[PDB]
Amino acid sequence: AVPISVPRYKHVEQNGEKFVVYNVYMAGRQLCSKRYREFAILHQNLKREFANFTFPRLPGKWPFSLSEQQLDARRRGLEEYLEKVCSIRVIGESDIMQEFLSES
């Protein structure tokens, strides 16, 4: 397993919208800060590019607004997802993942 982690989530404000971002680290160094919907897009993109793999489930949506505890659970689930997919070299090194794990 590669040393990928998502040790923090944060409530942010930007362009007038309030939302949550998840801060992704590799070997203790921060790579990106991204909202859940960007992870959902990453998942779709990876599945289409790596069409012959069967990907693990991304943490899912809920029928209600998330509590703090659920934000923390979502964070943990996103970390578990990244631990799995990033530990596969062709996926971990893909242009898709390298773009995701960076700041514009």
Side-chain angles (χ1 to χ4, degrees), residues 1-9 11-12 16-17 19-60 62-98 100-104:
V2 303
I4 188 110
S5 64
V6 190
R8 293 293 189 271
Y9 70 88
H11 293 266
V12 298
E17 180 185 11
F19 54 95
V20 173
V21 288
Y22 298 89
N23 292 349
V24 180
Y25 287 65
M26 180 72 84
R29 295 293 176 178
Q30 188 172 355
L31 295 191
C32 68
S33 180
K34 303 251 174 164
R35 59 196 298 187
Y36 174 76
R37 65 155 159 249
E38 298 175 284
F39 283 87
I41 287 162
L42 171 69
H43 182 57
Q44 278 192 355
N45 287 335
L46 289 177
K47 287 192 306 183
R48 169 164 297 105
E49 175 70 19
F50 298 98
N52 60 322
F53 285 74
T54 297
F55 278 74
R57 273 305 218 262
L58 196 67
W62 298 87
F64 39 70
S65 55
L66 283 69
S67 60
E68 282 299 290
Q69 169 276 309
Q70 275 150 355
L71 291 175
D72 193 49
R74 171 172 279 179
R75 175 196 59 77
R76 180 171 52 250
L78 292 173
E79 172 174 281
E80 292 165 352
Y81 174 87
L82 289 178
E83 291 174 338
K84 288 173 198 155
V85 299
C86 292
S87 295
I88 299 175
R89 197 165 150 202
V90 289
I91 299 176
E93 292 171 10
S94 60
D95 293 349
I96 294 171
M97 183 63 73
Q98 293 296 307
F100 181 83
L101 298 174
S102 75
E103 296 280 1
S104 282

